[PDB]
Structures are given as structure tokens and as C-alpha cells.
Enzyme design. Sequence first.
Site, short mmCIF file in Angstrom:
data_model
loop_
_atom_site.label_atom_id
_atom_site.label_comp_id
_atom_site.label_asym_id
_atom_site.label_seq_id
_atom_site.Cartn_x
_atom_site.Cartn_y
_atom_site.Cartn_z
N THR A 98 0.83 -1.20 0.00
CA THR A 98 0.00 0.00 0.00
C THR A 98 0.86 1.26 0.00
OG1 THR A 98 -1.82 -1.09 1.18
CG2 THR A 98 -1.76 1.32 1.22
N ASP A 101 -3.75 4.65 -2.20
CA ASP A 101 -4.14 3.75 -3.27
C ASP A 101 -5.40 2.98 -2.86
OD1 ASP A 101 -3.14 2.12 -1.34
OD2 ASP A 101 -1.61 1.17 -2.58
N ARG A 137 -5.56 -0.81 -3.45
CA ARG A 137 -5.28 -2.23 -3.59
C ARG A 137 -5.04 -2.84 -2.22
NH1 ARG A 137 -0.47 -4.68 -7.45
NH2 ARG A 137 -1.83 -3.81 -9.07
N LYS A 168 -9.11 3.21 1.71
CA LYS A 168 -8.14 3.24 2.79
C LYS A 168 -8.18 4.52 3.60
CE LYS A 168 -4.91 -0.10 0.91
NZ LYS A 168 -4.51 0.16 -0.50
N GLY A 181 0.23 -1.49 7.71
CA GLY A 181 0.44 -2.55 8.67
C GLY A 181 -0.77 -3.47 8.76
N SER A 221 4.29 0.30 1.85
CA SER A 221 5.40 -0.33 1.14
C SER A 221 5.93 0.56 0.03
CB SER A 221 4.96 -1.68 0.57
OG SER A 221 4.00 -1.51 -0.46
N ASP A 223 5.70 -0.19 -6.92
CA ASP A 223 5.53 -1.09 -5.79
C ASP A 223 4.41 -2.07 -6.12
OD1 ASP A 223 4.68 -2.44 -3.54
OD2 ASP A 223 4.68 -0.67 -2.23
N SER A 236 1.00 -1.70 -4.00
CA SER A 236 0.13 -0.60 -4.38
C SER A 236 -0.33 -0.77 -5.82
CB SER A 236 0.85 0.73 -4.22
OG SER A 236 1.39 0.86 -2.91
#
Lengths: 223, 231, 233, 247, 122, 234, 52, 175, 55, 229, 234
Positions: free
Chosen positions: J18, J34, J36, J50, J64, J146, J183, J186
Site C-alpha cells: 500500500t 491507493d 489495492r 483506505k 500494517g 510499502s 511497488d 500498491s
Amino acid sequence: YDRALSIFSPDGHIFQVEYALEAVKRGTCAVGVKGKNCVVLGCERLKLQDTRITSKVSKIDSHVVLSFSGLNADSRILIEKARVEAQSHRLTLEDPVTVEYLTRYVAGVQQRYTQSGGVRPFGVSTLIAGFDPRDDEPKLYQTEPSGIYSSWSAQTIGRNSKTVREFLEKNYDRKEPPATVEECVKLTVRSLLEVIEITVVKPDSDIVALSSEEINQYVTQIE
Amino acid sequence: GYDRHITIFSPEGRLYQVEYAFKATNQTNINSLAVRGKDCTVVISQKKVPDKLLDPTTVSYIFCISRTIGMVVNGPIPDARNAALRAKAEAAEFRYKYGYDMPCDVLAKRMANLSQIYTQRAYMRPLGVILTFVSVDEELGPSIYKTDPAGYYVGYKATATGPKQQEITTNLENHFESWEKVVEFAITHMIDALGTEFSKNDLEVGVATKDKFFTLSAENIEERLVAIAEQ
Amino acid sequence: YDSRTTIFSPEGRLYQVEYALESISHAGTAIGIMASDGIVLAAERKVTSTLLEQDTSTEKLYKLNDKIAVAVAGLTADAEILINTARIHAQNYLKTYNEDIPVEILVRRLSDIKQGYTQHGGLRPFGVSFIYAGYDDRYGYQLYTSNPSGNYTGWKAISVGANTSAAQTLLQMDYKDDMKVDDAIELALKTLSKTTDSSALTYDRLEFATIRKVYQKIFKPQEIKDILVKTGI
Amino acid sequence: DRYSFSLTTFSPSGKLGQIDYALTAVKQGVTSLGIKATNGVVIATEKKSSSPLAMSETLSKVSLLTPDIGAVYSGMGPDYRVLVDKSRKVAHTSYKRIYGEYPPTKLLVSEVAKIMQEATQSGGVRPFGVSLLIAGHDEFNGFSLYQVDPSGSYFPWKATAIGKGSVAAKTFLEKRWNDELELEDAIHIALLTLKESVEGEFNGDTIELAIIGDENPDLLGYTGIPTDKGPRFRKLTSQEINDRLEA
Amino acid sequence: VLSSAVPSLPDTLRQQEGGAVPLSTQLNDRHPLESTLKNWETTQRQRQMEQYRQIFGIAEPMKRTMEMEIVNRTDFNPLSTNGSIHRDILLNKECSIDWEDVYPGTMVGDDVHSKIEKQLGI
Amino acid sequence: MFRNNYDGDTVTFSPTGRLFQVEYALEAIKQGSVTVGLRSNTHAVLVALKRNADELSSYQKKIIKCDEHMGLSLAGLAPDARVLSNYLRQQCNYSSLVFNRKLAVERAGHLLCDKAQKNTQSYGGRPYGVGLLIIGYDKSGAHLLEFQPSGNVTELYGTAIGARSQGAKTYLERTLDTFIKIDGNPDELIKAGVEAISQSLRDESLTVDNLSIAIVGKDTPFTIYDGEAVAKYI
Amino acid sequence: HAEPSGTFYRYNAKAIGSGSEGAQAELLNEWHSSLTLKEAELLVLKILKQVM
Amino acid sequence: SINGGIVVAMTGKDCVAIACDFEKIFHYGHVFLGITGLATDVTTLNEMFRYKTNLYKLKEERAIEPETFTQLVSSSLYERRFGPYFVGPVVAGINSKSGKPFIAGFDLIGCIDEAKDFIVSGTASDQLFGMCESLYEPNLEPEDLFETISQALLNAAGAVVYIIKKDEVVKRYLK
Amino acid sequence: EGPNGFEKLSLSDMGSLVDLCGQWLGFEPSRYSEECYRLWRCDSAAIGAQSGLYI
Amino acid sequence: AGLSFDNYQRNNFLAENTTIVGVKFNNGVVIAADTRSTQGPIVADKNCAKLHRISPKIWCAGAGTAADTEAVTQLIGSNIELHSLYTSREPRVVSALQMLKQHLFKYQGHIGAYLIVAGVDPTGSHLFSIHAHGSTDVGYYLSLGSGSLAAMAVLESHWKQDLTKEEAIKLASDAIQAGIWNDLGSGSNVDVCVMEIGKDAEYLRNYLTPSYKFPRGTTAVLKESIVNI
Amino acid sequence: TSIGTGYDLSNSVFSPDGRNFQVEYAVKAVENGTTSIGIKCNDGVVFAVEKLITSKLLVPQKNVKIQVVDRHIGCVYSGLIPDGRHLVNRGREEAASFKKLYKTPIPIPAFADRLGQYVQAHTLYNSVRPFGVSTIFGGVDKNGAHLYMLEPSGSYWGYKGAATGKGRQSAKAELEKLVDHHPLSAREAVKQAAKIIYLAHDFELEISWCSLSETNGLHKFVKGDLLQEAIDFA
């Protein structure tokens, strides 16, 4: 002195504990007779009542029985505590509760509830009957709200107790106790007629509630 | 019966024990006054000693609860000092928990809520003091909130307390740049309402500003009285 | 000897508990009748005002569990706490034994709770009496009642609340053990009509429910009116 | 000291002493009323203040428990203020944090009643001296209006009034209520009824009125995610009430 | 609860815990956060009282604790595990939520009389 | 008359400011048997007149030892004396374990003072009905403390508490100038004490059974003389 | 003899309960150091005779 | 062992389909819950949710909607965050009022994965994620929905399929 | 002290009481006192707990 | 009460056998993330929201352990709502920070909630980041997840003082796009929220958005039945 | 109205006039004690007591009534003995704790507040009774001399001159004249304090004082020639 459990009267007895006994005297009559090898318990019993979902004699265990007099609500809870102790003793220990042990515990609960001014003592006197495990000696005990437990050959508690405890005193001989199931049952029935449900407990966890007592009533009535 | 000695409803539906607490606020025979300026709040309070031996320096009913909040208590001081320590601790805890300074109104709510306990609990008596929190909130600006033993708390644009609060309040209702001006304004109406001339020893003043709340010293009060005399 | 509930008077009676029973005598009468193929619960909605929402305002009859219901007489506030406890206790039995709780056990637990409040100084007796109607395999349809003292008794047809003596007398003379749920309904309507202090027994003053065949149906006011006229009340 | 004898006990007549006295305190309290309309609910009351110097904005008797629920009281303010603080807290612990949505009116009223009832059998606390007219909206039950008394007994009402002018106002609401009332009509009725009960001056400053009606996205504080719509409880400003009065 | 027959053993039956299987000696392997989290509130409260003692003197903690004991001991409701309404005000938790509030957490020993005896130590 | 309304407990002050419930506790000592205590510069002595419940009963213990260096006598309620004496003994032993110091006589009398004054401020409990006469000898020297149930501990050269203790007190005052100068003569000091208690007698005479004597000093750890050992001093 | 007051006394001979005043008076007349066990048992019964 | 069964939920057009490989699919009113994982936890959760939903019905006089039940399960699962239930549950149902089909899936501690297309849980899910996506389409008919859900379940792996209508539920078994 | 019929007398009173009424009644004071104390103190309603309640 | 540890030992026995960015601009703060969500390498649920809402003008986004972030965020949201009602004031961002960090510190970081809290209060705009252990820091721009490193590069490269509302949205969106491409955790779409001092928060969901019908009867059926509600 | 029947049998009860009579009764207990005065000087404070000697048996050196709460604080009380000594020890505990934590002697104004809260805390609940002592205490700190006087109600103020006990009206009247006449040096006040006690009044005179100049901020008693000089002046 009347309005507290923690206060002794000048003459030296706690009135509040005594007042609990008069509550028992207002309750329905209960009777108990010890034979040579059996114990008999008799009790005093509207139109629209559901008689199929009611027995004043509640068994605390397979071999122990407990009648009561006084406030029914208090008895129903005192019985429950005794039942749990009977199984708990059967669990922590291996042998079933002794009849003297159960009445000692039940009396302790009643005695325990007298040890504070914020608790109403149970207005119930129990009449515990049964046989010790693997024993043939009948044992009958009586407990009181004060917490005193006694062993009786024959006792009656509740409505019309003095009159019934006088009939038993003259008709029951400690040196000539009844030696047959019929004999003790007749005495218990005759005891109740001076004012019917009869329960008979026999050794080795053989508890039976009698039916068709009219035969004894008809026999006793004629005599 | 018991309703007179403990805080429970009487047949008339009133708590006598709580109402007797109000009458205890006038035992000290001290009356106060709080008014709001454009940018500051000022509170006035009499300082009847009256004994010669009694040191006037320690005779103060105004407490610096927090950096920005100060409160004036009408009633016995032993109950006032107990209330101060409560408010003096609630404000600090609020900053710790919520990370910003205690607002004036919320403090009255907390103290008023605590007073509500005493009016409901049978074994807890009402404190018996009237607290007048004065501060300059960063959001609402100057504000005055008064708490009473009954548990009520109300915001005031201008308030007076004590035996002669009715006399003082009526004058303010008729009437209705620096904190020195409001101090003179507050003192003048106290003199006019009560009719008694004041000196440094007979008066105590507390001022709430944007930065902090402070209590004027004896000499500072004398200066304001001198300015009034110039009129 | 009546200032607190933990004091026995010289006559060995609890005045505080007795006063609680007298309190119920001033409440709306609730009547329950057990038929050969079901049970009937009825109650007089004493608190009445045409501004009151007669619909969606069940105050006498409550659903403890499927196949169980209670008619409440006395302090409605006290009942809600016991009723919620009964609902929790009923589900615990199901969560424990995967079997619907027997009516006898549920009544026994509630009566024990009420008894305890008569045995503690700081707790006053619950000024409420219930009429439990339910069905279980052990006994089938059964009807109970409970007092503030914490003692319950089984009944075929029982009336609780105001004018219980008058209503109970009518039940004795008319109750036939072999009636149907229907016939129980007419009798329940009949008993209340002659017992209510009101000039007439209108639907807005009245509440109903029935357990039969097992479905329990708390009657909405629309059909309560229909049955009332059907009975000729 | 293990115990404390109950403050509330039955009298020989079967009545609870403190409960009846608590109802009297509500009766002697300031009047407050509520009206349930076809498309909304109205709760109104008038503010009595110690002195005119008091800030009327701080004398908030009508309060928000949930965005769709509101309450008003008659009696002791401190008891109501404490109850509202607990009622809001209970609405989050019991229901929202478990079901993710605010509780319906009937459930919230029941939990408030439970709080008031547990004070009716206790050795330390007298019963709360307030009766709350709790008005709210539920997605299923729709608009509702409940009155909860010191005893903990709550009843749903089409229209009701509590306080000094309860009997006079309730009879007046009796003659001027119907199932076809519109929220605008209900507000007009509520202002009328409150005018006979109020002693002295009658304007938007001495009167505060709150309504449960159509949503108010402008009061939500944020935009987007249309599934999350605004609140229904709205406290009419003194400006709005004054305009209503002249009409 | 210790057994009445023998005052040296836990009453396996009255102590409904899933038999004697949860024996005493075995409740030693615990989650690292269990002990700290169980009595976290107590530690903060006691620490708060210590600061009051240091600054405001022993009088203030005595007044705080006496008020709480008055509230706790005068409140007996065997049909509710919820904290008293006045308890929150004194603890200053009247506008706060915690997992202990959201998640407050048998035929034999859950009766009212069990709490009456424990409440009075009868 | 008016005293009945304000003597209910130790929490109600009378309109005149009197606290009756604790006054009665002080008066309870007069029910106890007379005990006499006196000390010289180097020696301290306790003399007590024991009483029996019946002629078939042993005389009640009236003198206790908290350690080898100090002890005490009792007068008033037996149950309170049991609580206070053993509580004090619980404090003699506590100090040695953690600190290894003898608990000084002055500290012994004052740690007990706080115990008695709490009961006079709180409801439920009652003021103790027992007075103590503590005698010991430490670095500082002889000590004689009289503890009253009202939390009043006084250093004394000599005193008497119990029934008819006024007579013994008068004799001690008349002879204060004498027995203080009895230094290094434990035998003579006891004889003065036995004479002092003798004035409190009405009917009963001294006997080896009822009489008990204690003495402590630099060369004498706390010793209790009872029975035949008391014949010489009579 | 242990009284409820919390005080115990060493008694050569003691009588408690109903009629204790009569029993104690006679025990004072009859008890002596040389009282053997056998006559003590008879004595106890003799005391019980009067006060029972 | 009976542990580790696979459950799948799919959303159609005014209908939802939930299928699973002792039964792992339970319904509380008109909302269906499928639990995958330890059998002991599956049995425990059902009794807990039956306890909670039954009280909800009695107190509110209304059946719990799938949206509300989704939060209840998440909150219940988060409790015991330390030592959670070794289960992955799936809820499928239709809201009574709006009629919008609803499905969701959770982790051990209640992370609401409110997917609008399909939900899977249990062992061998990794294979079933792709198969559902390859085969799934939006707005399937109830009969077409059955074919897509059944084919994904059988080929991915007896089996049982529930087709939930507004006022009708169909329970089917597959070879 | 105490209610009627339960009055308690202190040991000091008992000594003052027998040795004074003996003056009027005329008994041998020492023998009379010796008899009375045994009846006073051994067990009586007047002595009560005073024999063991006090040191 | 609370979290129980009811089956910690049992679970141990069984086991033995994420991108998020915050950008503060001149008249407010922008939070973007994002959409995902991944259950391991698998994409459990795309199009996921999110951006949590602590209050109308205080929004949160975390990484996390998902459940931990959702659990605490909702819990703090209730406290903010209750406190605001209690005090009758618009809640402060610092208020949320104190209870949020105090709550996390109480659990010794076992509650793995790493959060970015952005909002506007009467005292101005704010932007904070919170760790599981309770440690926090304040910065003009932040990034989390991430893909934080990729997003931070865009922020550092282009960020400047007193950014405008339009520039901040573009910068935050561009930063999230960098994490989306570079990444794996994400991906999908971008959610953007804009909080301004004098305006209502604007939640720009989906701000940027970068046949096999079998014939009926194919699957054989053993039996069928009708279930009753 | 000085009795307040009905509202005087319990503590923490407000009378219809707002008065708590139990506290007022505790004040009357103070008025029965030995008169004690405290004089605030330019450089320190002075304390005086009319210790009424009861008997020769008391040890003169250990029979001291002017307690020393801390090295720099002097305390004298009038009223119930159990409450006065109980308050002193509690005040002694607070002074030690403040020094322990902040490593500086406790300021007098701070010390008074700590005592005031404790005394006031007993007027809140019915399970406890208000302390029946009015305590005069004072000392010297960074801000100079301070004299305080707390009542049973918990109210305390700073004083230029304080008096308590039975001999209160006379001492206060003369004490006012002293302040009016000399609005003192630590030396002069000692003579004046002795004079007031003798005017107020078998009794002995006990005097103590604490000044910055003549005792470098420590509290010491009056003995030897200084004492006699004060008696001669009186």
C-alpha cells in the site's frame, strides 16, 4: 433490640433470629418419621392450579432427601446450594455426602447468612432425611434459620407443629420405634390427620413417592 | 425527615440539603463581580478582613486555576480551596489527555458534573460554594462561567454573586482597550451599587488576558482607585 | 419493621415484600389461559391516551424466546431488566445445549433473581409479576406466574394485576379443561370485559398474544379489533 | 459498610416514595413538549434563566445524542446533562462499535431507561429527577417520539408535554394533532402550545426548538461518498424561530 | 472458591472453568501483554495519586479514594456489569471509550446470591 | 439528659464541645485493678494488684514483657489490652529483623498513640478502654510512660491507674523527692512501689498470689516477680 | 474457661450455663486439692443433680 | 479431517450465490454466513452469532440485515485479537429494504473485504481467486449465476450451493 | 447501669454495699463480707462480665 | 474485559504442529492513498477505501495490520465525537494524536497500526504520522506503506512552500502513481481527500482511474431443495 | 441559635441557615483549651503557652506543649489532645515528604494548605468528625516570617497575631494593642508574649520563637536568663 441481628436482647437472645422462626411456623406443615430401616416424610398441600408441574419433598441426591417449611422462595435456593455441594463433595471426594454432613452444610449456609445486618436470614427450616452411603441406619435431621441442626427420631415443622409434635411424642416410643414401612407410614398419616402426600426413602438410594394413600387413610380413619 | 439531612427528594420534589448549600455561600458575606472586555475578562471581589490582627495578604478568594483560567469563589474558603485543587487538577489532566489547554466552559462542566454527584449521592454532601471561572478562550474569546452547588453552570456576559448580587446585577443591566480600563469600570459600578468606598486593603482584583490570568497586588489596586478619583 | 426489606416483623412476615405485592394490585390486569392446543395471553393497557401510540407500543407482553412469552403486571421499568436477563439466559442455554430452554428452568432462574432482591438491604423487591406462557417437549404447553417474593406456581388459567380476585372467580366457573385456543380467546376477552373498570373494553386499551400449533403471535391492534367484535364485546 | 439500605422503598400503599417525589420535581419543572409529524418530529422548550445577563446559547436544554436522535428534558438540568453524556457514550459502546451504525430510537431509549431504573433500587443514589422527551428517526421504525420518566418507564407518544404546563399543553395538543400533520405545521403547533405555557416573554431567545426531519448534508461537514448522508437532528437558531413566530 | 469439604482445594464444580483441567500451576505461561494490560488502568491511577500526594499532599488522594469507595460500595446491581455513571465522572472517563467498554466480556454459580455473598463477604 | 443525644458514638460533638464517647473509655480504666509505676534515675518498677474471677480461678495476668529491656502493665478492658500489648510486641520484634536496633521506649509509647487516636475519629470503631504503664531502660536510661486511650502519652516519674488509683498517686507525689534518689538500690525502689500501691487497697491485703512486681534497669533486664518471689517485698 | 469477651481463666472447678450460680456456690463448698478423679465424677453428677 | 473446507460467494443480478464443499453454511434470518477453518471455531462462532442475532431480533423486533451483520462479525472477530479464531468467514445476503445483493469476506481478526464481485476463503483459495475472475461476469441471472459459481467451485477443488433470492432460497447439491 | 432487672454494679460498689448494709442489719462484718463476696463474684446477675471483661 | 487472550495458548499449540501520502499546502492539507488490498501475494480486494474518517475534518490512512488500523481508528473516532459533543467544540487534530498515541503506547506496539493523521482545526492545519509503538512526528509532507519510498521521492523532488490546492492534489496523486507503478503492494485507483481551513472536506474517491457464460444445465445436480426463512 | 437541634447530630449536614453545627461544636471544644498565642515579628515569630501544671509526677523536660513540626516550623494547638497530636504528626509527615522530594524546607503557606485540606476533609463525610483543635503554627522561609491559624472548619489565614483557648478574648484584645502600638524584634516579642499570657491568666509559662537573625532561621525554646527576663517583664 428487635430490628437487628447483631444486637442481643437484655435477657440474652437475638429477637430478629427468633422472628425468622415464626415465619417457619406460618409455612406449610412438614412431617418426618424414622423407622428401624426407613424414613417417611409427609407434607401439607387451588382449582385451576397445574398439578402436573408442581412435590414439597425435593431430593438433594440419590440417597438424601430434604423437606422444608416456611418461605418457599428461600427454600428453593437453599435446596440448590445443597445440591451443588452434594455433587462437589462427590467430585472433590469419592464418597457421597453424609446425611450429617449435608445438614451441617445447609445449616452453615443459614448460619452464614445471619452474620451480617444487610442480609435477610432464610425463613426456612429444613427436614433432611436419608441414609449414609452403604449404611442401613435411617437418619433424620432438622435445621433452623438460626443455624442449629439437630437429629430427630420424628419431627414436624410449620403450620400446626406443636399439636402434631404432641401427637408424635405420645404415639412414638424411642424404645418401640416402628419396624415396618406400613407402621411408620400409618403414624405419619395419623400425624397429618390431627390437623395427603407421603414420601418413603429406603437404604441404597431407593426413594419412592407413595400413591393411593387413601387405603391408609381409610384404615386409620376407621380405627 | 431524612430528606432534610440527606440529598433525597422531599414530598414537594425539592432537595432541601442542596438548597441549604446555597445559603452557605453567603456566610462569608462577600460579593463579587465579573465583566468582559473586548480582549480581556476582569473579576472583582471584596476583601472584608475585618479583624486588625488578620493579615489581608492571605485573605484571597481568587485562585489561579491554570495559566489562562482563574476562578472566584463565594462561600467558605475551606470548601473553596478544595474546589480549587479539583479544578487545578482537572485542567492539567485535560491538557495531558487531549493535548491542549483546558477551556473555561468545559472546566465548569467538569466541576458542575462533580457537584451533581453530591446532589445525588446520599453519603456525599454538596460542596457549598459558587465558582465563577473567568478566562479568555482562544476560540470564544473572553467568557465567564458560574457554577453552583446544585450542579448548574451558565455562561455570563457579566455576573455578580453574593448577598447583594441583585443590587449589582440590576445596575449592569441598566448599563448594558486595555484591562486597566475595565478594572476601573468594574470597580466604579461596585462602588455605585454598594455605595461603599474602597481601598487597596478592602479590594482584590483578578484579570484574565490572552496570555495568562493574574491577580493584581495591593499597590496595583491602589493605582486603579487613584485613576477613578481623577474622574 | 417495614423501613427495609431485610427485617422480619414479630409476626414473621416481610412487610416490604407485601407492599410490592400490593403495588401490582394497582396495575393493569393480565390474564393467561392454557388451552388444549395452545396458550392465550391478554392484558389491559391501563396507561391510555389517544395521543399514545397504541401500535408498536407493547408494554405488557414481551417475547423472551421462540415458544415463550410473558405478560407483565406492575412496574414496567423493573420488568425490562428482568426480561432482558431472561432473554440472555434463554440463549445461553441454547448456546450451551443447542436445545430451547424449558419454561420451568427459565421461570426458576427469574424467580431466584427476584428472591435475591428481597434478601439484600440495598435492593428493593421487583414490583412486577409475570405470566409465563411457553411450550417445550418435557411438558408441552405450560403456564406460570411469579411474584415479587420470588415464588412461582403453575396454572391452567391465571389472572394477575388489578381485580385479580374477580377475574380469577370468573375463570373457575367457566374454565373447561378441554377447550381450544379459540375458546380460550373468547374466555380471555370475556373475563377482562367484566373485570375492567372502564365503561367498555376497546382495542386501544387491550393487548393480546397466543402460542399454539409452534408459532407465537402478538396481535396487532387491527386484528384485536376484529376479534373483539367477533366475540361481540 | 458492606452495604447501604435502599433509598427507594415501597410505601404501605404500594407506591414508591422517591419515585413519586421525583415525578413532582419534573412537574414543577419548566415545560417541554414534542410533536410527531408525518415527515418529522419536533421537540421544544423555553429557557428560564437566573438573570438576563446569562448567555442563552449556553442554556442548551435540547441536545444531540446521535445525528438522528435528539432529547429534551423538564426538571433538574444536572441530572439530564449527566444522562446525555452517558447516553451518547452508551450509543457508541453498545451499538455503534458493535454494529457499525447508530442505534434506533427505541433501543437508545431503553438503555437510557435502564440507567434511570438502576437508580430506583440503590442505597446511594436517588432517582433522576428528569423526564426526557427523546425524538429520533430510524430507517425501519421511522420517526418516533418517546417520553421516559424517573421510574425508567418509557412510552411512545404521538405528541406529549411535560412540566408545569403539561396538562394544559397536552390537552391543547389533543385538539390540534392528526396523522396528516406536516413538519412545518407541527412547528407552528409547537410554537403555539409553548406560548400559553410560557410565562413572560416569548421569542426565539427564550425558546429553543429542534426538529428531526429531512437530512442536512450542509451540516455533515464533508462531501463525497453519498452513501454517508448528513444528520437529521437540527437545532433551529434564534433567528429562524423569530421568523416563524411572526408568521 | 475453595471446597467446603476440604479447605485446601478449589471447588472444581462450583468454580465452573472446564473441570479441574485448568489447574493452578498451569496458569503461568501467559501472553506477554496480558499482565501489563490487565492492570494498566490501576497503574496509571495509582501513579496519578502519587503525584497528587507529592504536590497536593496526602489529603487529596484520601479525598479521591474515599469518594470512589463511597460510590463503589453503595452501588450494588447484580444484574449489570457496567460501571456506575458517577464512577466515570470521578475517573474522568465520561467522554472516553476503550476496548474494555466495547467488549465488557452457567446453571451453577452465576446466580445473584453468589454476588451478594461476595459483596458482603458473608 | 441532653448527654444521651450526643453520646451515641465517637463522631458527634456535644453542643458544649464535649466528646462523650471517648470520655467513657477513659472512665473504663477505673473498672480495672490498680497498677502503680515508678522509676529512679537508673531503675523503673511496676507494681500491679491482680484480681481473680472467683476463688477457684487463677489471678489474671497483668504485666507483660515486650523485650528484655522494657515491659508494660494493663488496666481496663481485657480485650483492648490483648490487642494493644501484642500489637506493641509485634513492633519490638519488627525493628530488630530489618534494622537490628532496640526500639526505644519513647518510640514504643508513641507508635501506640497513633493507634488509639484513630478510633476516636472514625465511626464504627470505639476508643480503647485500656490504659498502659510502660517501663523500660535504654541508652538514655530509665523510662516510665502512661498511655491513655485518648492518645495521650506522658513521661512520668511515677503514676497509678485503675480503681482507686488516686490514693497511690497522692502517696507518690508526697514521696517523689525520695524514690527518685533511690538509685542503684532495686530492692528499696520496689518496697516504695509496694507501699505506694498499698494505699489504694480497701479490703484485700497483699498476697504472693494477687501481687505482681516488675523491674528493669542497667543491671536488670525486665524481670517479673510473681508468686513466692513476692513474699519478701510484702 | 473462655468467655466470649476474649478473656480466659484457669479454673480449678467451673460451672457455666443455666444454674451456674448455684453450681459454683456448691463447688466452693465441696472442691479440694485432694479430690480424686472418681469422687470428682460423682461430684460433677451431684452438682448436676441440684441445678438440672 | 473436516477442517479446511472451501467456501465461495458471488454476487449476481438481484441474487447472490454461496457454495461450500456437518455443514459450513449457516443462515441467521435472510443473511447467510459461511465459515472456513477449524471445525471447533466454526461450531463456536455459529453458536455465538446465533446467540447475538437472536437477541438482536428480540430486542429490535427486526431481522439483522447483511450489512449490519457484517459489522457484528467483524467486531466479534476482533475480540480475541490475541489468539483469534482460525477461521475465514464469508457473509452473503440481500438487504430487505434496498434489495442490493451483498457479500463480504474477513480475515482472522475481521478486516472487511467488501468485494462487489466474489469472495472466497479457506484452503486452495489461491487457485479459486483466478478461476472466479476468469469466469465471473457482472449481472448474472440466478440460473446463469449457478453455472458460474458451481463450475468454479468444482473444477477448483461433495459440494452444496445456495441461491438466495429476495423471498426464495434454493439449496442444491453437485456431483 | 442497664435496663430494669439487669442492672450491673461495679466491684467497688459491692464492697461499699455489703460493709455498709451490715452496719444496719447487724451482722459480723468480716464473716458477712466473706459470705457475700463469694455470692457476689462467683456468678451473679450484678457482676456480669466485670470479672473477666476487665484486667 | 476488552481483548481477552482467550486462545493464545491453543493457537500456539496449533502453530507448533500500500501507499499513503500526506501533503500540507498553504490553506490546508491533502491526504491520498491507493486502493489495492493484498492477502499475501494475492490481490484480495481491489477498489478498497483506505481513507478513514476520524471526524468531518480529520481523516486517517494507515498501513500494517489492517484490522488494527481499522479498530483503533474507529475507537478514536468515537472518542473525538464524544469529546466534541461533551465540549461542544470542533475537535483538534492534536487531541486525536494524544489519545491515538496513548492508546497505542498502552498496548506496547502489539496493535500494529501505522497511521497518517491529517486534518484542520480552529488552530490551523496539521499532519502527523503515528507508529504502532506510539512514536509520532510532524512534517509538511509524509508518506507511508510499502510504496512510501517511491512516493517520497516524488514529494521531495517537487514539493515546495505554500503549495496551492490544485498543485497539492496533483503532487499527492502523482506521488501515489509512482508507488502504484513501482511497488507491487500498491495499485488500482487513487483516493484523494482535501481538507481546508475554511471549507468542508472533499473526499475525492476514485480521483484517478488508471464471454464465459456457460449454457444452463452444464453442471449436474444431485438434488434440490427450498429453504424457508 | 447556637444548638441547631435536628441538624447537629450528624456531620456533613447543612442547617437551614447554611451552617454545619458539628464544626461549630468543634470550635467550642477549642475554646475550652489552654490559651495559646502567636506573635509575628519583623524577623520571626513567637509562641507562648499557659501550660497548666497538673502534678509534680510529670517529667518537666519531656512535658513540652509547643511542638516542632519541622526544624523551621513551630506548632502550638488548643483543644482535644488526640486531634492536636494527630494533626501535628500528619503535618510532620508532610514537611518531611516535601523536603524529601524537593530537597528544600516546606514553605509555611504550602504547609498550611496541606493541613487545611486534611482538616477540611473530615467535614465532608458523616463517618468522621471534625478535628477539635485550632492550631497556631508558623516559621521562617525564603519569604520571611509567617503565622497561620487553622480552625476545625479547615479555614486558615495569615495573622500578625493569633490567640486561642479559654483565655482568648483577653489575649486577642491585648494582642491587638501590641500590633497597634508597635506596627517587633524577636527579642521584644518574647517579653510581650510572656506579658500577654500572664494577663490572660497554677500555670507555668512556655515560650518559643524562630527568627532569621537571632537563630539563623531555626526554631528554639526560651530558657535560662532569657526566660526569667520575660517573666520579670510580665
